RNA sequence: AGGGCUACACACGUGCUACAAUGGCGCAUACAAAGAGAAGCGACCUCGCGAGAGCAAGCGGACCUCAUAAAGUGCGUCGUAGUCCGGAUUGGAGUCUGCAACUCGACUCCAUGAAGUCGGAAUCGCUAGUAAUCGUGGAUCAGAAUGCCACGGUGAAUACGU
């Protein structure tokens, strides 16, 4: 392909709360810190909560009422 | 705000209806009225049709959609401009 | 002055020229001036560099100009993003805290243009 | 792209059995992916197309090709040769890499993701979908963004039936709700 | 005479006095430090909202006895300013008379 | 059952606050009046900056609670600055009530604290304890007032005249 017009396609890291770290090339540049992936995803599971996927459980145990 | 010593507020019908759903489906909402009930992190992933005075406006429960009231997401007056 | 990346004034009571931090009124000003152990009515130009560094590393226990600014920004950001009513008041740049709206709120709305 | 390797090895291995193909060249291949963004309203502003262009440029590591309206039309008050689109052609490893990127980052990132469709296959195992919002890609800022513009996609394969593209994509564990 | 509003008030007061001393202690369960906020007083709240919100003593407007008026009420006499002024003029209120100083 | 009466391009009307050194803050310090008080006041006590919470005596009251009056006085501080004036707004975190505080409660703490430099044309009130100001209490009231009513506290000018 051409040069100097195509965006930069470095390989960055997709490290999700899923805990999976994948090396994709993209136009991101920085190390990417995620929340959900092809794994730890609802549709890719049947578990409610497919991963902590957000610690608002903390506030929910900050107010404890159950 | 609500007193901590007092806790959260949520209708029992809402909780139990919510429970039967987390028992027995994921695919459809509930048609509620309790704009004053709170959103439990356990209701996440649902898209309940909450009343607003005349209409059951639906609200998809997400992580951040936890610490407010059902009435917070069913506006009541329709302003457009003058 | 250059503490916390800002340039708090000089020839000013220490509690007061401490109020210049975006996040310190007088209360937190006094709080810091005590937690570091410096007199209040000592002007800023009346302060040494040991106490300054003490202040540097004492104010640090708060959120600061850029950090706090950004912080509140992200808070309102979650407001807007979450899709709530307060988010809508904020979106409009209106009273968010429950004021009357048909006449007042020349603070959020701005003066009576139309 | 690992997906490419995975294809070449495991998906290849699977499909030769799955279709009983006697020649690997008879076996389907993903040949290209085209991301078209029918901006359309670029008749209004250039920068939105530019923003869309920046968007389609940022999302995939390949400068875009700005499409133009074929003819002028009154139904959209578009004049002929006017840039009412922007698209990119991903093929090869970039295609595969963006593929892995896609199916493993942005597909979760779907709002109320209920599964991806299994029928928007144009008849020859060439799939076609619609994206409503770009923010699913973390290549987006979501704060320094200008719109929620989507685009449409035509993943043109060498599979020849819609079902074959379906099976092929299933080999990639496509959602297929 | 709007006997609908007055039947609502009487019905509301009747059930608040029926289930009285119940939401009282159901509240006593909740302003006290025990019950772990989740074991007794929490289940207690459930029981609260099972209990008719229409048995609370705050839903009442404290309406005038003769007219059932929402406004201008006065906890001393139980009647509006109007009905009470007419009685005051007529002398049926012992001792009451227009003040002047 | 919910929502509205609380919507908000806007205009107006009342009312509140301020724009400052005759003052702001801090400190200390006294002088009221009146009323209310029992599904209430609630001393104290204890916790909690605090919202308040627990504890809780007494009080149906010339006796117990609101309940310190504030303004003042003196100390210092601020030093005329959008300021140590302001304190809008907004964020967060609370306290409180209620079935419940999103619409649509109040308060508390922290934190930015906006306009705002005394105000067009015009225009209002008032002749003495009045104006002016200080504060107080009460009603309604689950909770809810800058409004209402009432109390005291400082306390002046000019009315030639038509
Ligand atoms: Zn993940």
Automatic annotation (TrEMBL), chain B:
InterPro entries, per the entry: Ribosomal_uS19, Ribosomal_uS19_bac-type, Ribosomal_uS19_CS, Ribosomal_uS19_SF
GO biological process annotation, one example: ribosomal small subunit assembly
Domain of life of the organism encoding this protein: Bacteria
Keywords: Ribonucleoprotein, Ribosomal protein, RNA-binding, rRNA-binding
UniProt KW Nucleotidyltransferase keyword: no
Oxidoreductase among keywords: no
Short name of any one Pfam family annotated for the protein: Ribosomal_S19
GO terms, molecular function: rRNA binding; structural constituent of ribosome
GO terms for cellular component: cytosolic small ribosomal subunit
HAMAP family per the UniProt record, alphabetical: Ribosomal_uS19
Family designation: Belongs to the universal ribosomal protein uS19 family.
Functional description taken from the UniProt entry: Protein S19 forms a complex with S13 that binds strongly to the 16S ribosomal RNA.
Name the record gives this protein: Small ribosomal subunit protein uS19
UniProtKB/TrEMBL annotation, chain C:
Recorded coiled-coil stretches: none
List of residues binding Mg(2+): 19, 21, 24
Gene Ontology CC terms, in alphabetical order: cytosolic small ribosomal subunit
Region (Disordered) residue spans: 93-114
GO molecular function, one term: structural constituent of ribosome
PROSITE patterns found in the cross-reference section: RIBOSOMAL_S13_1 (PS00646), RIBOSOMAL_S13_2 (PS50159)
Family the UniProt entry places it in: Belongs to the universal ribosomal protein uS13 family.
Protein name: Small ribosomal subunit protein uS13
Taxonomic source organism: Escherichia coli
Gene from which this protein is expressed: rpsM
Automatic annotation (TrEMBL), chain E:
Keyword Ubl conjugation: no
InterPro entries in the cross-refs: Ribosomal_uS14 (IPR001209), Ribosomal_uS14_bac/plastid (IPR023036), Ribosomal_uS14_CS (IPR018271)
SUPFAM superfamilies (alphabetical): Glucocorticoid receptor-like (DNA-binding domain)
GO BP: ribosomal small subunit assembly; translation
Gene Ontology cellular component terms for the protein in this record: cytosolic small ribosomal subunit
Domain of life: Bacteria
GO molecular function annotation: rRNA binding; structural constituent of ribosome
UniProt entry keywords in alphabetical sequence: Ribonucleoprotein, Ribosomal protein, RNA-binding, rRNA-binding
Subunit structure: Part of the 30S ribosomal subunit. Contacts proteins S3 and S10.
Family of this protein: Belongs to the universal ribosomal protein uS14 family.
Task of the protein: Binds 16S rRNA, required for the assembly of 30S particles and may also be responsible for determining the conformation of the 16S rRNA at the A site.
Protein name, as recorded: Small ribosomal subunit protein uS14
Species this protein is from: Escherichia coli
């Amino acid at each position: 392909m051409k040069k100097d017009i195509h965006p930069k396609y470095e390989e960055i890291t997709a490290s999700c709360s899923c805990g999976n770290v994948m090396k994709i090339r993209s136009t991101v540049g920085h190390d990417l810190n995620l929340d959900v992936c092809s794994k730890c995803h609802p549709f890719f599971t049947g578990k409610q909560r497919d991963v902590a996927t957000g610690g608002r459980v903390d506030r929910f145990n900050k107010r404890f009422n159950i | 705000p609500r007193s901590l010593k007092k806790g959260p507020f949520i209708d029992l019908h809402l909780l139990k209806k919510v429970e039967k759903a987390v028992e027995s489906g994921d695919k459809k909402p509930l048609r509620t009225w309790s704009r004053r009930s709170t959103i439990f992190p356990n209701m996440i992933g649902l898209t309940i049709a909450v009343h607003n005075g005349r209409q059951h406006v639906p609200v998809f429960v997400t992580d951040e959609m936890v610490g407010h009231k059902l009435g917070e997401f069913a506006p009541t007056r329709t302003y457009r401009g003058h | 002055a250059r503490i916390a990346g800002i340039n708090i004034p000089d020839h000013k009571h220490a509690v007061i020229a401490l109020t210049s931090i975006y996040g310190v009124g007088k209360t937190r000003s006094k709080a810091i001036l005590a937690a570091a152990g410096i007199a209040e009515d000592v002007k800023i130009s009346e302060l040494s560099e040991g106490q300054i560094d003490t202040l540097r590393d004492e104010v640090a226990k708060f959120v600061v100009e850029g950090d706090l600014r950004r912080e509140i920004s992200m808070s309102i950001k979650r407001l807007m993003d979450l899709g709530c009513y307060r988010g809508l008041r904020h979106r409009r740049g209106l009273p968010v805290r429950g004021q009357r709206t048909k006449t007042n709120a020349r603070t959020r709305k701005g003066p009576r243009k139309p | 792209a690992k997906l490419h390797d995975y294809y070449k090895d495991e998906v290849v291995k699977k499909l030769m059995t799955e279709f009983n193909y006697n020649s690997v060249m008879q076996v389907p291949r993903v040949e290209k992916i085209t991301l078209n963004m029918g901006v359309g309203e670029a008749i209004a502003d250039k920068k939105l197309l530019d923003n869309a262009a920046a968007d389609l440029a940022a999302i995939s590591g390949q400068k875009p090709l700005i499409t133009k309206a074929r003819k002028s039309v009154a139904g959209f008050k578009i004049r002929q040769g006017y840039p009412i689109g922007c698209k990119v052609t991903l093929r090869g490893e970039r295609m595969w890499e963006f593929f892995e990127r896609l199916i493993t980052i942005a597909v979760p990132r779907i709002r109320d993701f209920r599964g991806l469709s299994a029928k928007s296959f144009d008849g020859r195992g060439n799939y076609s979908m619609g994206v409503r919002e770009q923010i699913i890609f973390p290549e987006i800022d979501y704060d320094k963004v200008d719109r929620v513009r989507g685009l449409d996609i035509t993943i043109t394969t060498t599979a020849k039936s819609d079902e074959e593209g379906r099976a092929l994509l299933a080999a990639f564990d496509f959602p297929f709700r | 005479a709007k006997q609908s509003m007055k039947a609502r008030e009487v019905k509301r007061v009747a059930l608040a006095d029926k289930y009285f001393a119940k939401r009282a202690e159901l509240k006593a369960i909740i302003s006290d430090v025990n019950a772990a906020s989740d074991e007794d007083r929490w289940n207690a709240v459930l029981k609260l909202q099972t209990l008719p919100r229409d048995s609370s003593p705050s839903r009442q407007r404290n309406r005038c006895r003769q007219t059932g008026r929402p406004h201008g009420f006065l906890r001393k006499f139980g009647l509006s300013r109007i009905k009470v002024r007419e009685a005051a003029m007529r002398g049926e209120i012992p001792g009451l008379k227009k003040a002047s100083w």
